[PDB]
Design a protein around this ligand. Sequence first.
Ligand SMILES: [Cl-]
Ligand SMILES: [Cl-]
Ligand SMILES: [Cl-]
Length: 93
Amino acid sequence: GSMGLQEDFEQYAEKAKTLPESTSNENKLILYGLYKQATVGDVNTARPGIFAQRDRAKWDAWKAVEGKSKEEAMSDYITKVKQLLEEAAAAAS
Ligand SMILES: [Cl-]
Ligand SMILES: [Cl-]
Ligand SMILES: [Cl-]
């Protein structure tokens, strides 16, 4: 990752903590998948079964961004968090 992007990523991963607890799980899943992809790369497990204890929705969100470089997924994660942060501020004003 380039330096400025890595700094941005760590900053926005920290700012993501300020999103309301009530943030839709649809968006939590999008952030989860990009965060996994950005930090550890391609999902390296098989899809959890429907009745498994492993969370299929989380795995699916990560599978969906397979193939993105660290730079790309950090990029997307940042843009999604930025959008959510602006929407949270709009909701509160
Ligand atoms: Cl920025
Ligand atoms: Cl929801
Ligand atoms: Cl992992």
